[PDB]
Design a binder for this molecule. Structure first.
Ligand code: ZN
Lengths: 595, 239
């Protein structure tokens, strides 16, 4: 079942708008890749030279980017996302080449065997796929054939995954707590390493796949001998879960980080000698060693914050301030939909408050650090408009989702919607038309209209067609629909319930409210538009019941309307009356009175 | 036309409840409640016809209806149903992404669990993984994530009405000892197989209600001879 969504944002989001899940460092180009919870992958220059380390954004994913792996000497990036896909990128030019769709839930982890250019992917669906990288990059629009290889045995959701450099061993970590080991060449099961009492989010193998390091939410790091199939050491240097591991080339020192924010370098042969490298400002999600020199000179660190810190390594914390800092942006952490179902108030991590227009897909004004709830109450308007969208803050930006069940639920008058009133508009229907305004197939004359005639969304707006619960089907920017590739993919992906409105120019159904009308202090059965104003009922009564210049005026002068014993405002619509005043059950009941 | 459920089940619940002395005393000293009152008066002044004097699971329906009755005629004027049966449980939910634990307390008149009875109630129970199409919305992650849900009892009731959907005569919750006083069970075999039965504590021996006949049975004929529609019910009174 297909939903339409779109993201309200600027054309360029230079900075991460949420935390960072994974990191990759290209030593030949001095480039750092960050995989964002904001769904964007970004390339940075790590020269302490440049004042602006930003290089490019890599934009295709629909949800958290959980993992990335640089392959083929920095030529190729492979990404894993909560949108259930694995994507193949040209890492030099920064564009998406292929999308693998074999996963059925969040893809959580990637693994890489450099000597075979072999990668593997794993996620919450308990599947592990193995991919030859040169086979994936060779994919074209004609050579469209792909074949798979997978591992079985995982009884639970996979959170981590590692291969050795030789591609002879692969291990997964999961909420099953057990580590599962296979031969990636044959997919044969090798062993089960038992010992952890919680999830395992961090795994490393030495180069010839004879030892393994696991970091676990039980707070321990464990060293494993694969020849003995057992744990040969347990290190307890953290207070909470270990989420991230790095190791030196000699597989003799382990760098660890996790929820307690502390980062340690521990000697594996002699645990008691360990060094507190730093305490980060937020739980550590991933770390990437600078490997310019043996004793690595620095470590890059990803946290739940949008900023990314490089910490220097020259040996009570070793470091107190990061050595380099890649700046991040604010996340939208709180959201309020106003009663007009048209505007939104936000608060972000900097405690800045903004006011937005969902319909025009844009910001209206920045309000700075005013009180958020006092600001809500200040903009309160007594009006009811049926719910017609949903908002989510998972990327740290505003993402709006439309569903067939209620997308067309909200008819409002053009005047109350703030448009020229020289006339009833359906909000969801106007938006769909703005989102698909550049799609030529929508350029239709109902006996030529392009767009909806009241507003546009910004041309750079991402428009997403996905399945409820997970799978993105197709994503483009609003302005790109006229493309030949885009029009083809739209025809294949746009559900008939959107076509109905955007192509056929068909009106959605109206909504009516049944109500009773009876004297205050003879019960009639009526029905009217949910947007009908109280005045019209007053006129009704004046004309056809208590009926002993303008009629609206005389009606207003003679007839008083009540609901739940409150005198009603002639400008209020039935919808609003029922929502704010009708406090009873069964049909709305209005009482009429001679003034 | 409304269905209260299986006849024998409902009768067995009613019988078990009569041998919850504090519930018995307070109804005797007292709708659905007035009928329950008259029925218990009769018994104190035929078992198969108990429910007739009066399908959602009957016990929970019954206690809550009395709770609502007593809460309402309290409003016009700690209802006694609450002081006898009300306990408090806590539902822990742990996001597996941020590993933050959030807690929510809930009142209960009866308690369902899906290890041992003693190990359950003393530790955690009803462990459940939220995943796939039913992930947890985490307020820390602001998105759907996998979660581990589990239940711990916060406040033990005077009488613990336990739904199991191997039972000990005494329960040690150390700080509180509980004695088994009633059982509602659907026997697989034994001379009472076929339908729901009530087994109750009376003074210092055990009675068994089967259809219309009350019969004494020896202690530990109980766990020597006792597959179900609504599981089985254990009533524990604290000492
Ligand atoms: Zn969370």
């Amino acid at each position: 079942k297909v939903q339409v969504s779109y993201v309200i944002r600027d054309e360029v989001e230079k900075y991460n708008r949420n935390g960072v899940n994974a990191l990759q460092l290209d030593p030949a180009l001095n480039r750092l890749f960050t995989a964002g919870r904001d769904s964007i992958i970004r390339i940075w220059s790590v020269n302490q030279h440049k004042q602006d380390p930003y290089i490019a954004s890599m934009e295709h994913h629909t949800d958290w980017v959980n993992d990335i792996v640089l392959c083929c000497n920095g030529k190729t990036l492979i990404s894993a996302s909560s949108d259930t896909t694995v994507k193949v990128w040209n890492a030099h030019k920064g564009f998406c080449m292929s999308t693998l769709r074999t996963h059925k839930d969040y893809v959580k982890a990637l693994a890489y065997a450099k000597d075979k250019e072999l990668v593997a992917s794993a996620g919450l669906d308990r599947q592990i796929f193995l991919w030859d990288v040169n086979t994936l990059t060779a994919l074209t629009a004609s050579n469209n054939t792909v074949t798979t290889s997978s591992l079985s045995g995982n009884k639970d959701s996979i959170y981590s995954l590692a291969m050795n450099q030789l591609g002879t061993i692969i291990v997964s970590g999961s909420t099953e707590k057990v580590l599962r080991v296979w031969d990636p060449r044959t997919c044969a099961k090798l062993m089960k390493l038992k010992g952890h009492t919680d999830n395992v989010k961090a795994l490393l193998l030495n180069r010839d796949g004879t030892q393994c390091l696991s970091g676990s939410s039980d707070g321990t790091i464990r060293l494993w001998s694969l020849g003995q199939q057992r744990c040969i050491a347990t290190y307890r240097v953290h207070d909470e879960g270990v989420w991230a591991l790095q190791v030196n080339d000699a597989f003799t020192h382990v760098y660890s980080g996790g929820r307690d924010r502390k980062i340690y370098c521990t000697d594996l042969r002699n645990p008691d000698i360990r060094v507190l490298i730093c305490e980060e400002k937020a739980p550590v999600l991933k770390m990437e060693l600078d490997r310019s020199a043996d004793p690595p000179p620095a470590i890059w660190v990803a946290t739940t914050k949008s900023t990314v810190n490089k910490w220097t390594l020259k040996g009570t914390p070793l470091c107190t301030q990061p050595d380099q800092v890649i700046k991040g942006g604010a996340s939208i952490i709180q959201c309020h939909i106003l009663n007009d179902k048209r505007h939104i108030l936000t608060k972000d991590t900097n405690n800045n408050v903004a006011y937005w227009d969902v319909l025009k897909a844009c910001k209206v004004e920045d309000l700075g650090k005013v009180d958020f709830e006092d600001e809500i109450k200040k903009r309160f308007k007594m009006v009811y408009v049926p719910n017609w969208f949903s908002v989510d803050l998972k990327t740290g930006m505003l993402t709006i989702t439309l569903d067939e069940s209620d997308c067309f639920a909200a008819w409002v008058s053009a005047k109350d919607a703030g448009f020229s009133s020289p006339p009833k508009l359906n909000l969801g229907g106007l938006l769909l038309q703005a989102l698909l305004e550049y799609w030529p197939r929508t350029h239709v004359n109902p006996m030529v209209q392009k767009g909806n005639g009241y507003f546009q969304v910004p041309p750079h707006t991402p428009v997403i067609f996905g399945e409820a619960g997970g799978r993105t089907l197709f994503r483009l920017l609003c302005r790109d629909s006229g493309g030949e590739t885009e029009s083809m993919l739209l025809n294949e992906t746009v559900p008939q319930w959107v076509i109905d409105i955007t192509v056929d120019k068909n009106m959605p159904k109206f909504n009516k409210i049944p109500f009773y009308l009876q004297p205050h202090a003879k019960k009639d059965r009526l029905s009217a538009s949910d947007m009908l104003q109280v005045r019209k009922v007053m006129e009704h009564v004046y004309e056809k019941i208590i009926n002993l210049e303008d009629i609206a005026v005389l009606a207003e002068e003679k007839i008083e309307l009540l609901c739940q014993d409150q005198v009603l405002d002639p400008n209020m619509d039935l919808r609003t009356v029922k929502h704010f005043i009708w406090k009873s059950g069964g049909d709305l009941t209005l009482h009429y009175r001679q003034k | 036309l409304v269905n209260f459920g299986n006849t024998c089940y409902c009768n067995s619940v009613l019988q078990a409840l009569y041998f919850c002395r504090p519930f018995r005393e307070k109804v005797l000293a007292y709708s659905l409640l007035t009928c329950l009152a008259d029925l218990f008066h009769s018994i104190a002044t035929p078992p198969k016809k108990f429910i007739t004097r009066l399908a959602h699971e009957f016990l929970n329906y019954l206690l809550n209806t009395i709770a609502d009755i007593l809460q309402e005629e309290r409003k016009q004027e700690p209802t006694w149903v609450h002081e006898i049966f009300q306990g408090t449980l806590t539902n822990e939910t742990r996001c597996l992404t941020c590993e933050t634990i959030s807690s929510k307390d809930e009142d209960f008149l009866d308690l369902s669990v899906d290890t041992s009875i003693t190990h359950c109630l003393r530790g955690f129970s009803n462990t459940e993984t939220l995943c796939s199409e039913y992930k947890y919305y985490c307020e820390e992650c602001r998105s759907k994530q996998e979660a581990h849900k589990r239940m711990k009892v916060k406040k033990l009731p005077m009488i613990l009405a336990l739904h199991l959907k191997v039972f000990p005569l005494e329960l040690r919750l150390f700080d509180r000892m509980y004695d088994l006083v009633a059982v509602v069970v659907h026997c697989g075999s034994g001379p009472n197989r076929g339908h729901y039965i009530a087994i109750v504590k009376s003074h210092d021996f055990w009675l068994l209600f089967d259809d219309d006949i009350v019969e004494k049975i020896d202690a530990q004929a109980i766990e020597e001879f006792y597959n179900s529609e609504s599981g089985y019910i254990l009533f524990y009174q604290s000492r």
